[PDB]
Amino acid sequence: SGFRKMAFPSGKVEGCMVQVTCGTTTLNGLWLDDTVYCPRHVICTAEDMLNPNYEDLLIRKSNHSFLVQAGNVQLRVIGHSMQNCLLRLKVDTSNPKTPKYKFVRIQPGQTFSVLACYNGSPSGVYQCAMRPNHTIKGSFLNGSCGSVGFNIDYDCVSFCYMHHMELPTGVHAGTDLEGKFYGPFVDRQTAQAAGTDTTITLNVLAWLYAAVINGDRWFLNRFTTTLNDFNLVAMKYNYEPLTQDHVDILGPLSAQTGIAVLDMCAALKELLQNGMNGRTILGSTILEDEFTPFDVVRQCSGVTFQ
Amino acid sequence: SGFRKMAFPSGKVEGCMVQVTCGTTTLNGLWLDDTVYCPRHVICTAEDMLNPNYEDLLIRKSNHSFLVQAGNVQLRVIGHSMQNCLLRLKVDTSNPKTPKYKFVRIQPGQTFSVLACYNGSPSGVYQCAMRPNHTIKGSFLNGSCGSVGFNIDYDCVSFCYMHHMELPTGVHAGTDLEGKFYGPFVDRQTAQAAGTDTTITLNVLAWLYAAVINGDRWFLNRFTTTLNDFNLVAMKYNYEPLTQDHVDILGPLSAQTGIAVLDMCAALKELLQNGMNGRTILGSTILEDEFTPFDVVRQCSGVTFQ
Ligand SMILES: [Cl-]
Ligand SMILES: [Cl-]
Ligand SMILES: [Cl-]
Ligand SMILES: [Cl-]
Structure with a gap:
């Protein structure tokens, strides 16, 4: 008996989390096989989120521009590319704790667990739902970009959310793991606001x-x-x-x-x-x-x- | 921004969970170093929870009476003993994923995360609080005995709850990891009821x-x-x-x-x-x-x- 909001145990995904830093910005990345995913806004500057052109901002850097840290271990980046709103940095090392996994675009209404992370290190997990207005009422502070959302079926981890932005009313907007936002939101510091839910x-x-x-x-x-x-x-x-x-x-x-x-x-x-x-x-x-x-x-x- | 009930990431403890079976009863055990903890009621029979004498019930078995399963790997038990309401079964193998850890008796009012498990396999995690009446409003079905509660400070896991019983109103009672119950509760099927909270x-x-x-x-x-x-x-x-x-x-x-x-x-x-x-x-x-x-x-x- 009982009924509580409950999240999926978070271990298989904790062993996926790294820290990506670019310049002065540090945020979280997910590391599966030889690749690490993170929000492309990791290259945007000390505020030039006001009007970023990313195709242009990214052509200004190389592999050695991103450092990826898994615990106390530097991952060498040896190639990177942009996929919608995410970057995908190839590393010299395959993650050896990569779980069986899938990427899924989840639908309004559905629920998923969020592992909140800072500087690459997991700090808590909680359940939520994609709202009909394509935000989620998460709980996220500065540094939590790249935190993921996932469900777990059997032993397979189905990733469905990576965190990118907080909106004016305090709710959160981000993308699936192909880099496509949920909702009309963009990774730029604009006036944009969650619509009515x-x-x-x-x-x-x-x-x-x-x-x-x-x-x-x-x-x-x-x-x-x-x-x-x-x-x-x-x-x-x-x-x-x-x-x-x-x-x-x-x-x-x-x-x-x-x-x-x-x-x-x-x-x-x-x-x-x-x-x-x-x-x-x-x-x-x-x-x-x-x-x-x-x-x-x-x-x-x-x-x-x- | 945001504010959600949130649990501690559960990985370090997921790698501690095993299945202990005794006769026809299967429940969960926690496996740290060479020892596995579980509720001593795991030896009580097809209902002789009505009036168990455990000192007596336990002297009727040996090491080969308990089988401990970590994934698909049988742990051989090579010694066992009872500590208040828990058994402690020594296994031939030290768990190699034992995190740094402590056992703490938590106080009414404090909160902790519960990894609910069935047959040794984690299935969800959620946060709660020790009520003033020494129960917790958990969410637990048949098979979840031995599920633990824990907090995590730095890299140290502080275990504080192991699950034993559900009470008539649907709230849950259990012990710390020394085997001492929280509350006036006993591991026997009695009329006993949570008091007023x-x-x-x-x-x-x-x-x-x-x-x-x-x-x-x-x-x-x-x-x-x-x-x-x-x-x-x-x-x-x-x-x-x-x-x-x-x-x-x-x-x-x-x-x-x-x-x-x-x-x-x-x-x-x-x-x-x-x-x-x-x-x-x-x-x-x-x-x-x-x-x-x-x-x-x-x-x-x-x-x-x-
Ligand atoms: Cl786009
Ligand atoms: Cl944020
Ligand atoms: Cl006792
Ligand atoms: Cl129960």
Whole structure:
């Protein structure tokens, strides 16, 4: 029993983290096989992030311009190239702790664990979700660029986020490990701002199933709703519309609990309309949307507290 | 910027985890140097947890009775002994990934990260706090006994919790790594129940400093209070009394923010009296007590958003 935000154990990725320095800028890189990934803004200067041209900024340096430090061991760079917003520095050494791995572009709504690192050294790990507005509410201080996000399936580490920027409201924007940003963001110091966000409906619904699998029934009700009626209510409270694809995703949890999705929808629309007055769900006052249906199945029992 | 519950990276401890099996019971053990620690209830039978005598249950077996599995590698046990509620099985092999480490008995109020494991294999990590009633609201399913809790200082891993039991309300009880339970709990299937808990006042206060270091001031007020007046209010809302030792602990955060502790106390007593109407603090509606003053200093800036 219990239900907590939980991250994937972080060891396989800790053994991937190095420090890349260029000039006076130091940040984190990920080191898999003979290659180290890091944010290309590592070459941008003492503020010429105001208007960088990177194709040009990068042609002004060589291999010996980047130093990569794995613990107390200098990696020699012997070639480098730019891939969208990331650099990829070839080193003379293959990392011998490279886990089996993949790079995946994750989708709004999905969750992943972030190992926050400073100067190449891991310092804490925490779970979050890609928001619908393509930011993440991380916790990052100066020096954490290049910190990665990942999920782990079996023994395979699926990298999906590398950290690049903080936005004016304090939320964070970065890219996948091909160097393509999540969201309309660019690696330049511009006026740019997270857009309006929305609550991940599929997630809240998964977390109500989690509260019933764990053994709580109190918000349920004898009603059902159509998708259409549900969404007209969702949209008013700034929830993402629910589609039949999300309805289908919740199939397994619904079958484990004997509650129809649309009956779960009625119950939420109630929680939306009547507030959570005074009561909590899995410990929260507030509908929580940073758990996916898969996180709830991973973490919950396979048997329902009926 | 940002503020999240965060756990310590878990790698140094992942390389400590093994599987111990005895008869039909399989659970997790921690493997440091030539020794593996695990809950002595690993020898208790298909329910004779109802009234175990362990001195007696253990004298009925030998070394070859326990099998310890590190990945796909059987550890031979070559001696074993009981230390309060834990067994300590000597193996023919020193773990070669033993980190620098210490065992510490942690105190109510303090926090630590838990690596949850099944059959010896890590599956997720999350942060929590020792409650004042000596339980922890973990998230643990069948098979997670022997999962450890730890903090990490520098490169030294300070182990402080090994998981043993779940209690009737769904919270969790276990021991330090000397085998002494936290709380009045015993490793027997008894009627025993977590007692009443209280909110960790020092923690909530640290987390208000965190909301001002991050840049939020809205709950502050022009009042101050004595300790005494504060506690008469605390006790009514079921907060632990605040003492001058806790007041002193908050010295550094108070100096970083220019807010007197007792002025912060006034502000909380207000939040207690007037509710948080409608507003959030660092994202929470609800005063959060699972961050210590040290977690807030580790995670926050050294410079205040003034
Ligand atoms: Cl681009
Ligand atoms: Cl940042
Ligand atoms: Cl005892
Ligand atoms: Cl348990």
